[PDB]
Design an enzyme around this catalytic site. Structure first.
Site, short mmCIF file in Angstrom:
data_model
loop_
_atom_site.label_atom_id
_atom_site.label_comp_id
_atom_site.label_asym_id
_atom_site.label_seq_id
_atom_site.Cartn_x
_atom_site.Cartn_y
_atom_site.Cartn_z
N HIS A 232 -1.49 -18.02 49.91
CA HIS A 232 -0.66 -17.04 49.21
C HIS A 232 0.79 -17.06 49.68
O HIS A 232 1.72 -17.09 48.87
CB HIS A 232 -1.25 -15.63 49.35
N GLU A 236 4.07 -18.60 47.37
CA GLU A 236 5.25 -17.80 47.08
C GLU A 236 6.52 -18.50 47.57
O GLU A 236 7.52 -18.57 46.85
CB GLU A 236 5.11 -16.42 47.74
N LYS A 239 7.41 -21.59 45.43
CA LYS A 239 7.96 -21.26 44.12
C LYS A 239 9.44 -20.94 44.24
O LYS A 239 10.25 -21.41 43.45
CB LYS A 239 7.20 -20.08 43.46
N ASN A 240 9.80 -20.14 45.24
CA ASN A 240 11.20 -19.80 45.45
C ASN A 240 12.05 -21.02 45.80
O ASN A 240 13.15 -21.19 45.27
CB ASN A 240 11.33 -18.76 46.55
O1 LIG Z 1 17.95 -19.50 48.40
C1 LIG Z 1 17.03 -19.15 47.67
C2 LIG Z 1 15.66 -18.96 48.26
C3 LIG Z 1 15.16 -17.68 48.43
C4 LIG Z 1 13.90 -17.54 48.99
BR1 LIG Z 1 13.11 -15.85 49.24
C5 LIG Z 1 13.09 -18.69 49.43
O2 LIG Z 1 11.86 -18.40 49.96
C6 LIG Z 1 13.60 -19.99 49.27
C7 LIG Z 1 14.86 -20.15 48.71
O3 LIG Z 1 15.39 -21.38 48.55
N1 LIG Z 1 17.23 -18.97 46.36
C8 LIG Z 1 16.17 -18.58 45.41
C9 LIG Z 1 16.81 -18.90 44.08
C10 LIG Z 1 16.25 -18.90 42.82
C11 LIG Z 1 17.09 -19.26 41.75
C12 LIG Z 1 18.43 -19.60 41.94
C13 LIG Z 1 19.02 -19.61 43.21
C14 LIG Z 1 18.21 -19.26 44.28
C15 LIG Z 1 18.55 -19.18 45.74
#
Ligand SMILES: O=C(c1cc(Br)c(O)cc1O)N1Cc2ccccc2C1
Ligand SMILES: O=C(c1cc(Br)c(O)cc1O)N1Cc2ccccc2C1
Lengths: 360, 360
Positions: A232, A236, A239-240
């Protein structure tokens, strides 16, 4: 027939939950003697855990407590507590007691299946009905971390009992894998996240895994853990990381990979996921764990990490990318449930007023 | 002659400190009109900042307050406040007022030179005399962060006045460099840390710097900052990273380098220092910022970062190495002093009792 629920709630909320270690969970047997012991344990422990958290629900601001969805969740907890009270005077030696008990636990688990989104609707109802305020928001944040961690712990107890005393993984003890290959779970979560990223963006970053087994450099890294919880958290995070990577590289056909390091030390098993997805300013990091700014993926993932004395931390570099780290205990003896308790210290947090802060 | 100090302390503690931005500091001139303005500002603002923190000293546990070294520091603050009170009725138009004021500020700065180690002796005296306790320890931790940040802010005001209104860097505004080349400061701190590491271990890791200027990839990264503060933070971090690297590689002649990334985003200027020094278990990370477990290098460095709305964060991977990140505001307009204030919310933190925590 049963007493009114408040009488049971007051009785059981006087006790503290009893945290179990991963090792204790693991050393639980599947015999008849063991099932009776599980029964006599859970008919006390589940009511203690239900009552403790129900008492904290009552400390929420009237505004949040007045919402239909919070009232609905409360009503589920009341009925589940009463379901278990039916077993107080039952004989563990009677096999029908044991089978009925397992049926009751399954019914409770199903009743509570949608607790997370239902509570989130409660938060939305509060915001829509009254408008949000900082004091209530802080109470909600404090409460929900504790409420959701409590729920995780109750589901753990129930799953362990129902899995052990009622398939693919007969080396598992309930939901626990005594030899969880961490990299294999990383790969499973990556694969599933890649399917999603590919669907929406027609591309996804590759995965690179490196293991650092400090004490035994050749040996693949294993641990005692509940693989579904680890999955899980990683799913998550992937995906981010994938979304950030593709979205920060719209011009590019070449995507930087997501790099994962799995390190095994004397005390910690740490998993770091590094992306070059362009990062996020520090100001916006705290909000990623806020229930209000939201999408409970990240806060709930961090609760899973915290549940066995671990953590999930994010550190970004705006303009470059982000590192996310899952900290787990390496040893099953150190992996002890982290459970909120209803007492004076707890009670005090909900006793807050609107005033100027201690900083300029 | 002057009133008794408590009368002044009560008067000035009613005001809140007034936080200035880096841009405001920078846009301060060196003319006579400007020096009079600085004088009329500081003869109110310095007493407000002195009084505010002196009121919090009085909230410390009797045990800590009773120590000779804490009493000594208190006495310095009292005398410094009184020194400034001598200027309440003086005429800014009189050039002798201005020159005497600068002399008084220099005397205060020197008087307070040893405040940090003297307070640390106070903490040791409390531990030696009474034994430490968790309640007092939490109060001390809360207080010292605020006390030392207050002190940083007072030294900033004094240094700005004395440097501007009384050499090598005439493009500097007092202690502020409007065009601080971040990598050059990184290199200076590395060089100094290398001298120390080489002395004790006859070897040190190399340095690798990478810059990521998100909006302008070719351009060297600059900012408005006080280079001495940035140097202080980096020097502390390099010393730790170097020590860890050499000590975890006793068998080796080849040392992994310390890698620094400097990233400039829209809002943040972030500096990450990565070592392969074998890491530290998560359990031991919090204690690195504790005044009690100590060696105030790390906590004070983090206060310098926090002083202009930044932060200093550590994330290790036990068995592998450690990343330390300094987060700074990229823009001088966002770089606003972070100052503690004496009020009800502040007052409440020192009002804590010994009881069971809200977790099992
Ligand atoms: O830095 C990040 C980011 C945030 C998290 Br929580 C993570 O676990 C990993 C990542 O890389 N992001 C997410 C995201 C989504 C669309 C656009 C820009 C960004 C900038
Ligand atoms: O991980 C670390 C470490 C700690 C901090 Br704070 C830092 O800013 C950089 C580091 O690399 N250490 C320090 C140290 C010193 C001697 C021996 C082992 C270790 C393990």
């Amino acid at each position: 027939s049963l007493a009114g629920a408040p009488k049971y709630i007051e009785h059981f909320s006087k006790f503290s939950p009893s945290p179990l270690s991963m090792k204790q969970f693991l050393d639980f047997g599947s015999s008849n003697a063991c099932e009776k012991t599980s029964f006599t344990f859970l008919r006390q422990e589940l009511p203690v855990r239900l009552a403790n958290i129900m008492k904290e629900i009552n400390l929420l601001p009237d505004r949040v407590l007045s919402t239909p969805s919070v009232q609905l969740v409360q009503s589920w907890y009341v009925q589940s507590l009463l379901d278990i009270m039916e077993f107080l005077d039952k004989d563990p030696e009677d096999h029908r007691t044991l089978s009925q008990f397992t049926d009751a636990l399954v019914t409770i688990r199903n009743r509570h299946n949608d607790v997370v989104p239902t509570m989130a609707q409660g938060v939305l109802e509060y915001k829509d009905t009254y408008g949000d305020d900082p004091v209530s928001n802080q109470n909600i944040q404090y409460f929900l971390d504790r409420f959701y961690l409590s729920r995780i712990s109750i589901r753990m107890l129930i799953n362990q009992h129902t899995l052990i005393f009622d398939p693919a993984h007969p080396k598992h003890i309930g939901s626990i894998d005594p030899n969880c290959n961490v990299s294999e779970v990383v790969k499973d979560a990556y694969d599933m996240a890649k399917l999603l990223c590919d669907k929406y963006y027609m591309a996804s970053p590759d995965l690179e895994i490196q293991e650092i087994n400090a004490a035994n450099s050749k040996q693949p890294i294993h641990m005692v853990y509940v693989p579904s919880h680890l999955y899980h958290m990683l799913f998550e995070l992937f995906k981010n990381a994938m979304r950030a990577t593709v979205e920060s590289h719209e011009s590019s056909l070449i995507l930087p990979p997501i790099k994962v390091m799995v390190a095994l030390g004397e005390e910690d098993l740490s998993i770091k996921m590094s992306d070059r997805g362009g990062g996020v300013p520090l100001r916006k990091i705290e909000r990623l764990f806020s229930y209000m700014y939201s999408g409970y993926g990240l806060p709930i993932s961090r609760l899973y990490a915290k549940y066995f004395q671990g953590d999930l931390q994010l550190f970004s570099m705006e303009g470059f990318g982000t590192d996310a780290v899952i900290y787990l205990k390496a040893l099953s003896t150190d992996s002890v449930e982290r459970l909120p308790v209803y007492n004076k210290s707890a009670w005090r947090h909900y006793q807050t007023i609107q005033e100027a802060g201690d900083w300029c």
